[PDB]
Amino acid sequence: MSFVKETVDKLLKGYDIRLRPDFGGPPVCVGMNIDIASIDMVSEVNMDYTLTMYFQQYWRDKRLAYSGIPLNLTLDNRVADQLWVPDTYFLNDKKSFVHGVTVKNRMIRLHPDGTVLYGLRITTTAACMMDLRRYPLDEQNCTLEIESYGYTTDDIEFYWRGGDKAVTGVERIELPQFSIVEHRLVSRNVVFATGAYPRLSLSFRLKRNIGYFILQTYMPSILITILSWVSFWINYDASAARVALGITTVLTMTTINTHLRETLPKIPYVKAIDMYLMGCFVFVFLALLEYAFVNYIFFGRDVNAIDRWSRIVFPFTFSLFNLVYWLYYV
């Protein structure tokens, strides 16, 4: 006990904390290992995802090497602050912290061969720009970028410890509106004016779930358009009936579009769902204009040719519109 105490104090003694291991020698080599716990809500409005993980950095420091005391020591909160650790940081994070309750979720373990293992429990909100042009039929690519802040590749090299097995816990993710199709681990040397900095990238590919939108967006619009087509089969002299039908279908379409864009994320630029809804709106508007033409031509100014043409052309045109939309966006 006291032997361990005085040996740890001696290990602290003679240690320069501002100097990395092997300052004049070859660069330090740090192996990263991530254990994902969960991916929380993913925001289209903010274009970011919140990720919780256990982040581990493994390296070798000959300064912190001891002989005897076969057990591997474990510094916890106070003397841990008196050791050099890499200045690793997440390039694209927007807000992150180490969990505090009950105690600081940090760990430092020193093996007798000078090896150091530094574990942290980190929650981080990372930026993920999204291509919301095929929304809700879109597929996204989010990334987490890990980089050294001050040291270039000549001083520190990073790598994935364990190779492709470095990152674990991907299966634990249970996002409601997204499914993780694939993930990748990449290592690069980004070149700045100062020099080549190390970089690691943990990338996920997400595919959105579509049945929600099929249930609440595409089906009601199609049903409302089919209802709007009923005017062509209603008698042409039923002015109040046909006018009420057409204008109320238009009102229902506007109601659907407005409340849909209220409940959906803001997303202040064009999507695919907007084009589909606008197509349905134009179809019902054209149906009402068709009745207006009928009323002016006949009964104003043996079914009539205008309605006979409408009955066959409107479903046919809507089918072609659906075909073009689905082929273009799928």
Partner: nanobody, 108 residues
């Protein structure tokens, strides 16, 4: 040799999302063959049989399919299916898995 095993789950399947396939040859202990998540993505296979086997899922009927393309004579064993909690731990350790199956037999 196209063999397809099927592990069907009933009950509170949501509370035990991850499902893992193991194999136990005669004499040898249980070995982790594969694991599949709830949503059907992010499958994880062992090093020995990473490319030979493929695991699929369909929650509409609560069943997990383990396909095998090319079988070797070291693969003769009793194949088990198991379920794991959401905060159990690692995938490769059978102790973390709570509910096991009787297990089928395969010989080649």
């Amino acid at each position: 040799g196209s063999l397809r095993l099927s592990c069907a789950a009933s009950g509170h399947t949501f509370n035990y999302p991850i499902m893992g396939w193991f194999r136990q040859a005669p004499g040898k202990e249980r070995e982790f063959v594969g694991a599949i998540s709830w949503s059907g993505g992010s499958t994880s296979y062992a090093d020995s049989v990473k490319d030979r086997f493929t695991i699929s899922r369909d929650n509409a009927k609560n069943t997990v399919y383990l396909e095998m393309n090319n079988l070797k004579p070291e693969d003769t064993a009793v194949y088990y299916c198991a379920a794991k909690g959401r905060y159990s731990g690692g995938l490769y350790y059978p102790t973390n898995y709570d509910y096991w199956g009787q297990g089928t037999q395969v010989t080649v």
